[PDB]
Design a protein around this nucleic acid. Structure first.
Ligand code: A2G
Ligand code: MG
Ligand code: MG
Ligand code: MG
Ligand code: MG
Ligand code: MG
Ligand code: MG
Ligand code: MG
Ligand code: MG
Ligand code: MG
Ligand code: MG
Ligand code: MG
Ligand code: MG
Ligand code: MG
Ligand code: MG
Ligand code: MG
Ligand code: MG
Ligand code: MG
Ligand code: MG
Ligand code: MG
Ligand code: MG
Ligand code: MG
Ligand code: MG
Ligand code: MG
Ligand code: MG
Ligand code: MG
Ligand code: MG
Ligand code: MG
Ligand code: MG
Ligand code: MG
Ligand code: MG
Ligand code: MG
Ligand code: MG
Ligand code: MG
Ligand code: MG
Ligand code: MG
Ligand code: MG
Lengths: 103, 117, 150, 19, 142, 110, 48, 56
RNA sequence: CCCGGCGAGGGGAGUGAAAAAGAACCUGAAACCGUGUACGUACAAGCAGUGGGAGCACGCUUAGGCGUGUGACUGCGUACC
RNA sequence: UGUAACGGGGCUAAACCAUGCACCGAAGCUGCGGCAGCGACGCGCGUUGUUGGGUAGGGGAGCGUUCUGUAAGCCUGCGAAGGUGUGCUGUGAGGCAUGCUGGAGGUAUCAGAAGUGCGAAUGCUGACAUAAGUAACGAUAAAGCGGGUGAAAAGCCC
């Protein structure tokens, strides 16, 4: 059984036990989060197409880690125009392990 | 107060050359060429971060169109039907379902078709 | 730079970059572009500004217990062992001793010792006050300093 | 490093005159 | 997660047989191109050939509209000065009927190594008999 | 037991010597000596002496039976070049490079 | 108050303009002189 | 006529792909002396096809 | 002591803390040129990267994903001053 | 030069005119996370709005290098500088740790001073490439053989 929930501006098809990485959440490590707006749930022939959210669908997850992603180098270079700019970036993320999914 | 540039200059060139590993010929051995290549790689990476978002959506749409048509509806009509039904699953997830769960995808198609009806 | 003013090669036809002097700074063994000359780095410190800075330093020393005001500081003979003994007894290792009548024996006894400098009240300098950990001052010196700085 | 250039030597062909 | 990508070592292509009799050239070629490329499969990956093997029959009877049967001209150059050669549609059909379909499909496939690989899956026969019965092609209306 | 012999500063460009070296690479010392014997190259003469020296070293210092020895590693490194001046027409000088080479032959039972 | 604790009042010491030291500096290449002309030339400029 | 661009080490090595020397296929063995020699050549000890053609 | 032309050069032995401190000698960068190993490469068109990405090899602390190396195929892409 | 006046394939619509309703489509807009400038508002921070493509050029704030004091301190043969890998780390110039190499220097901090940063200047000096194992080996008066010496002989001796 898997579920689709929109978190951090993006959606995710997850199944209990799958650790997912979402946009940084202001939630302590040990805490548990609940995503109420579950777009869809599926148990074989059972398929809950939320319109837009599956009534009573709730995904329970525990925060597992908060960290910065791989360093990206932003290079800007205008040729023949004496212009060149450099910038780094490490996007913040939050890993959440799905404790449970409730129809 | 004379300053020698050997130690510092060496480090700067080593830095650029390290970023040019894997490049063909002079691009990975010669600083003048490696430098230009490393800059161009950065320009391409910047431009391609945006393109990655474009290409994947393109891929998702094509997969949805294929799966939808197999269920007897076109992509344009499926998306329209989905919105009328108020379903808000993104194209990324629709594509994932279209490949891994065809029964579920068939359900979305029927819902979309009913919304049009 | 030693050399002649002969143009190394003709201006045109050789296919090489134009040259005019073997002493050019773009050349090995050439002259320094902006070669240095003897410089005088002395700055002007307004008398008031100088004296004011001294008073600020003296004040911090008092607030920080870095000024040991003693009536008399002297040694019987110009012997290093004597002053070393006295300083350990007073429990000061690094100290700038200012005296009203710079004693000759005291000047000699402290000469070898490197953490100890003996100066008259008219030889105090701002850096020495800040540098040395303690600034022992004789009764005479304190009045002299106050009167001089006034 | 490059050596001191040579003075004008005999030339094989006349330069074309464009005129 | 990451979007699934078709894997060439696991892709499952199928065999189909189509009849070109009466089918308009371009309209038929487009469907072949789509199915040859794998654009009808939800597992389609632009860098993997997920298409299917398609056998075409009666390539000599494919149809064209208007006056293309005589006016459509297939040009080619031989790499020799003044080497431009021109063959009309009727001429091509009589001399090399299979080429008429092949050219259309090849022109509609991606240009590059993968496109060439996709083209290898199209078996165009000028008649109504083929020799791929072991592959058991499944009739496919087009 | 990898015994090594080296002819350092051997007058001969590495490119030329490398031609001969590629022939005996991985060949039994005996087969190598024969191939060198009938190779019409100056480098063959150079390599043979180094190969012979290596074989001698294995026997004298390492007591290795010559019958088992094989050319495990053979490579030619460029040596210091001797700079020379070759006069040309019209008073122009063209430097000449007298390229040397370092010949390292390695012999071992395995 | 030690020799390695004294500091200048904020604003007292301003770093000078170092020309011709890269794009990042902002005074690289032409070094503020612009492009060509008499003013861009070393020793260039009209009299008062 | 000279190169407009320096050739690469790859191209240099590609041209030299045909420069490899080949060794003699096999040496022949004299029936009498037993020495090895280039086929159709006298041995170093002056034996050809079992006959001492030249002395010493 | 050994190979070698009573060679050059080298392999041992010995000296030294060290001989990859052996006199072409402190350290010993880079261009440049090699040997070995892994992967790719002989139906394939262009600033040689970048964004996707299969397979293979390797080292890992579930048998596991991961890390490292390579990069078929594919989107975009005509150096710098 | 070659089709060469839809980008191509192809098209009788996959052309054109009308009407309508979907969808695709950008670094635009929105969502989610983060950073910065400026202005308001409260209490130093918070909160709210808004802005952040840039050449010449102006303004501001930094990194690093050598040298002086701090430092007769601190680090260092239980391995300094330099070299060369690796991992981590900051928005950047960077920083930090560590394996190996190296074999004796290095230097926190906060200040001070500059020969303080290079890819270009047909730049200067040295080194090493490419063409390339290519052209050429300098009068077309000319060599052949035997013997000798030698590790080796077309070239030396006879
Ligand atoms: C050589 O070049 C000069 C100019 O530099 C003259 O043109 C001369 O005529 C040339 N030589 C010949 C033989 O024509
Ligand atoms: Mg110095
Ligand atoms: Mg490298
Ligand atoms: Mg000088
Ligand atoms: Mg005065
Ligand atoms: Mg030069
Ligand atoms: Mg394309
Ligand atoms: Mg002459
Ligand atoms: Mg500017
Ligand atoms: Mg200019
Ligand atoms: Mg102008
Ligand atoms: Mg101007
Ligand atoms: Mg001037
Ligand atoms: Mg040109
Ligand atoms: Mg050749
Ligand atoms: Mg020797
Ligand atoms: Mg050395
Ligand atoms: Mg090196
Ligand atoms: Mg072909
Ligand atoms: Mg192939
Ligand atoms: Mg090509
Ligand atoms: Mg392209
Ligand atoms: Mg024509
Ligand atoms: Mg977008
Ligand atoms: Mg925007
Ligand atoms: Mg800006
Ligand atoms: Mg020493
Ligand atoms: Mg200091
Ligand atoms: Mg300078
Ligand atoms: Mg520049
Ligand atoms: Mg050269
Ligand atoms: Mg040639
Ligand atoms: Mg030739
Ligand atoms: Mg010739
Ligand atoms: Mg003779
Ligand atoms: Mg002769
Ligand atoms: Mg004679």
């Amino acid at each position: 059984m898997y579920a689709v929930f929109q978190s951090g501006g993006k959606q995710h098809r997850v199944s209990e036990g799958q650790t997912v990485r979402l946009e940084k959440l202001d939630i302590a490590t040990g805490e548990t989060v609940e995503f109420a707006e579950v777009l869809m749930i599926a148990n074989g022939e059972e398929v809950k197409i939320g319109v837009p959210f599956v009534d009573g669908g709730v995904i329970k997850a525990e925060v597992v880690a908060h960290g910065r992603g791989e360093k990206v180098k932003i290079v800007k270079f205008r040729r023949r125009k004496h212009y060149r700019k450099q910038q780094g970036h490490r996007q913040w993320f939050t890993d959440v392990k799905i404790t449970g999914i409730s129809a | 107060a004379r300053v020698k540039r050997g130690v510092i200059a060496r480090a700067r060139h080593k830095k650029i050359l390290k970023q040019a590993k894997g490049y063909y010929g002079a691009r990975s051995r010669v600083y003048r060429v490696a430098f230009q290549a490393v800059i161009k790689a950065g320009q391409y990476a910047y431009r391609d971060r945006r393109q990655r978002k474009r290409q994947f959506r393109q891929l998702w749409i094509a997969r949805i169109n294929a799966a939808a048509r197999q269920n007897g509806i076109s992509y344009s009509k499926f998306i329209n039907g989905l919105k009328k039904a108020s379903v808000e699953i993104d194209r990324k997830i629709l594509a994932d379902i279209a490949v891994f769960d065809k029964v579920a995808f068939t359900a979305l198609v029927e819902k979309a078709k009913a919304a049009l009806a | 730079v030693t050399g002649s003013g002969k143009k190394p090669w003709r201006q045109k036809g050789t296919g090489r970059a134009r040259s005019g002097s073997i002493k050019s700074p773009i050349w090995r063994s050439g002259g320094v572009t902006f070669a240095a000359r003897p410089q005088d780095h002395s700055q002007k410190v307004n008398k008031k500004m100088y004296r004011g800075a001294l008073k600020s330093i003296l004040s911090e020393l008092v607030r920080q217990d870095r000024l040991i005001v003693v009536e008399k500081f002297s040694v019987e003979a110009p012997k290093t062992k004597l002053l070393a003994q006295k300083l350990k007894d007073m429990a000061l290792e690094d100290v700038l001793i200012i005296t009203g009548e710079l004693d000759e024996n005291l000047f000699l006894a402290a000469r070898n010792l490197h953490k100890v400098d003996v100066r008259d009240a008219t030889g105090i300098d701002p850096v020495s006050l800040i540098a040395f950990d303690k600034v022992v001052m004789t009764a005479d010196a304190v009045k002299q300093v106050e009167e001089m700085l006034a | 490093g490059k050596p001191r250039p040579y003075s004008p030597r005999p030339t094989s062909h006349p330069r074309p005159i464009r005129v | 997660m990451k979007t699934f990508t078709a894997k060439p070592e696991t892709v499952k292509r199928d065999w189909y047989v189509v009849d070109a009799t009466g089918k308009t050239l371009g309209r038929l070629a487009t469907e072949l191109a789509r199915r040859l490329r794998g654009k009808h499969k939800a597992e389609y990956t632009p860098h993997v050939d997920t298409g299917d093997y398609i056998i075409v029959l009666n390539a000599d009877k494919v149809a064209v509209t208007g006056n293309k049967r005589t006016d459509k001209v297939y040009y080619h150059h031989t790499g020799h000065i003044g080497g431009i050669k021109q063959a009309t549609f009727e001429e091509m059909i009589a001399r090399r009927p299979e080429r008429v379909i092949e050219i259309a499909v090849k022109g509609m496939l991606p240009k590059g190594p993968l496109g060439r690989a996709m083209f290898r899956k199209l078996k165009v026969y000028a008649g109504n008999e083929h020799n791929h019965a072991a592959q058991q092609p499944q009739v496919l209306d087009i | 037991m990898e015994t090594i012999a080296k002819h350092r500063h051997a007058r001969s460009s590495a490119q030329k010597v490398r031609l001969v070296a590629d022939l005996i690479r991985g060949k039994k010392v005996s087969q190598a000596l024969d191939i060198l014997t009938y190779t019409n190259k100056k480098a063959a003469v150079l390599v043979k002496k180094v190969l012979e020296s290596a074989i001698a070293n294995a026997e004298h210092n390492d007591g290795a039976d010559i019958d088992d020895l094989k050319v495990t590693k053979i490579f030619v490194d460029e040596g210091p070049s001797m700079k020379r001046i070759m006069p040309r027409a019209k008073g122009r000088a063209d430097r000449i490079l007298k390229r040397t080479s370092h010949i390292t032959v390695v012999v071992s039972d395995r | 108050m030690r020799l390695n604790t004294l500091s200048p009042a904020e604003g007292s010491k301003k770093a000078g303009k170092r020309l011709g030291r890269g794009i990042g500096s902002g005074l690289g290449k032409t070094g503020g002189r612009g492009h060509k002309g008499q003013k861009s030339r070393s020793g260039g400029g009209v009299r008062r | 006529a000279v190169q407009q661009n320096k050739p690469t080490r790859s191209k240099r090595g590609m041209r030299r792909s045909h420069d490899a020397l080949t060794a003699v296929t096999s040496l022949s063995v004299d029936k009498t002396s037993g020495e090895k020699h280039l086929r159709h050549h006298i041995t170093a000890d002056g034996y050809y096809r079992g006959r001492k053609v030249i002395a010493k």
